[model samples]
Target: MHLICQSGDVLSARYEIVDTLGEGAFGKVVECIDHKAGGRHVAVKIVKNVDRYCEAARSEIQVLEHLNTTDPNSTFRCVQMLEWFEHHGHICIVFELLGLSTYDFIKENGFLPFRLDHIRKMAYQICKSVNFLHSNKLTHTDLKPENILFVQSDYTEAYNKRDERTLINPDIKVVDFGSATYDDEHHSTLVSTRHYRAPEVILALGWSQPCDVWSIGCILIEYYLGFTVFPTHDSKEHLAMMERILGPLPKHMIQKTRKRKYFHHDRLDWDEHSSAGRYVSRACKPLKEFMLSQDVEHERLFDLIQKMLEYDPAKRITLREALKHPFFDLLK
Candidate 1:
C-alpha cells in the first residue's frame, strides 16, 4: 500500500486506474475505466503483495461467484464481481461499481434522521441480503453502516427536497466480502468493529449466525437515533453500554465471563471498578423515552430492533423473522 502508481497506467491492458477510490490495509482501491467491456466505471482492488490480500481476494471472489444476489428490482442484492488478476506483484480484482455508501451519505447529508418510511425500505433490503448470506451457510463477519452502500446516488439528493413518493425506492447493496466466512468453519474472533460487535464476539465465547442479526439491529438503531447504539471505550464500557439499553445482563450470563474484573457487584447494581468504565451508572433508556427524545414515531421499529438485539444469540430474531416484522406491513 506504500507505493502509488501514476494514472493511465493500464492494469492488464484492460482496465486503467484513472482514479484512486481509497487506501487501506490491503492496498489501494482504484476506479478503473473499463476498455474491453465498455468504458463503464468499475472498482479495481489492488493488493500490495501476495502477503496482503491474495487470500482476502480469493475469499471475496468465491462468495461473489457462488452467490451473486444482484437484482435491480429486488431489495436483496450483492455487488457483482466481474473479474480478477495479478499485476506487478499486486492482486488486482474487478467488481461492479456501486454508488455512495450509507456511511458517507449520512455524513455528507448532515446527521439528520431519515424518514421512517425510507428507513423501512433500507431495513428490508439489508435484512434480506444478510439472510440470503446466512441461508448459503456464510457469515458476513463485518456488518456496519460502512459496508452497506446505496445502489444509486440520485435518490439521496432528490427525495429530501421533493415528495419522497415521487422517487424510486432507494436501494442498498452490501459490499466488502473480504470479511465473509463459512458459518460451518472456524468462528471468527475479533471480527466486527466498534458498537456493532456482539457480546459473544467481544467476550470470546464463540459466535453464531445471530452475530449478523445483532450487527444489523445495532446499525438500524444507529440510523434512527442518529448516534451509535453502543458507544464505548473498552470491553468494560462496551458491556456497560449494552446494559444501558438491555436493562441488565442476567446473573447466569454475567457469571459466564470474568466481568467482575470490570464491575463491582453490589446490592443496588453492578458498579464500575475499572477506569475505562466512564459511562458507569449510565441508566438504560426505556424504549419509549429513548425514541421520544429522538422524535421517532414508529413502535414496530422499536420492537423489532429490540428483538434483534436480544442478548442471547439463541433468542435473537432470525433473519427470516426480521424480514417479516410488523414494521414492514405496519405501513404497507
Candidate 2:
C-alpha cells in the first residue's frame, strides 16, 4: 500500500519531497520543502493506502486538528501541523520540521544521560503539554522518548573527564498523535510501547490519562540514567522487573489481573532461580538506586517518579498535580 514517491516530486503543487526521514508500520515520513511557504522545510507523514491504515490516519488528523485549533499560536509543546491532504490515495500530513528525537539525541550523544537541570526543563514542558491534552479530554497513550523531539538539536561540546556535549536549547515538542485518544473513544487492550506501558494497562484493569503520566515517569528515568528502566519483551519478565524496581504489584491488582499465569499465591509466579530471573535481578534494582546523588533534587525527582509509577492507577499522580511537585521547583 506504499505510495511510490521520489525526490523532487511535488505533491499538490505545494510540497517538494526531499528525502525519506524514516519508515514505520503506518508508512514513511519524508523531508519536504513547502514551496508555498517560502521553501521552508517540513515533515510529511505519508500514510499507507490500506483501509485500516487510512482510517487510523483520519483518526490522527482529528486529534491533531483539535490540538492545532486549540493552540493556534503554537504556544504549547505539542507539534504543530501545517496542513494535510490526499495524494495518490495516500493520506499525507505535514508537520513543523523538528530536530532529532530525544532517543536519537541520547544515542548520538553517546548515551551520556542528560543533565539534571536539562531533564527538569524537558519534563516540565512534557507535563505541561500532556496536561493540556488531559484538559481537552485527550490522552497521549503513546508517550515515550521516541515521540519527543527537540525544537533544535544543536549542541556545544564540553571537554569533561569524558567527551560530552550539552544541548544548546532545551525546547521540545511531543509528536506522533496517531495513538492519542479522546476519553470517549474505545480503549485499546494494548495501548503503549512495551517499556513505558503502565501496570494497569498490562493487567487489563483499564487506563486513561494517568497511563500517560506513568509513561512520563519512565521517560524521566531514561533521561536521567541514559537507559531504559524496564527493559523487557516478555510480560512476565516485565512484571518481574517492575516488582524489582517499584516493589510488589499491589495484592488487589494481582488478585484481579486477567493475566493470572504471571502470578501464583498472591505473588509473581516467576522462578527467581531461573536464567531469566537472574537477568531480571541483575538488570533491575530498586528505583532509588538510580539516583545520581543524595541531593534534594535527586530525592524530589525520585519521589515524583515513585508516585507516577504507583501500581494502582487511582494512586498515580495526575500530570497536573505532578507539575507542582517540588522536583520542578528549580524551573520556577
Identify the leading candidate in terms of lDDT: 2
lDDT of 2 by residue, 1-332 (tens): 33466788898899999988777678888889999999999999999998878987898899999999999987778999888999988999999998888998999888889998999999999999999999999988888898899999999987785988799998999998888889998989865455588888888888899999999999999999889988887878888999999998888898788888777778989988899999998999999998889999889989999998888898889988999999998788
Give residue 36's lDDT in candidate 1 (0 to 100): 93
> What C-alpha lDDT do the candidate models reach, one value each?
0.73, 0.89
Model 1: per-residue lDDT, tens digit, 1-332? 54545578788888977887666666777888899988998988887676536878778888777776434343458777788888876777798887767776666666655667778888988988989888888888778887887777665245443323211556888988887888667665755445478877766667878988998988888777656757664675667777767777656566665434644563113456544443454544544456844433477788888998888888889999988788888545
Highest TM-score against the true fold, candidate? 2
Off by over 4 Å in 1: 48-52, 69-75, 155-169, 190-195, 258-288, 292-297, 330-332
Q: List per-candidate RMSD values in Å.
A: 4.0, 1.6
Report the backbone clash tally of model 1: 0
Question: What is the alpha-carbon lDDT of model 1 when measured against the actual structure?
Answer: 0.73
Candidate 2 — which pairs collide?
none
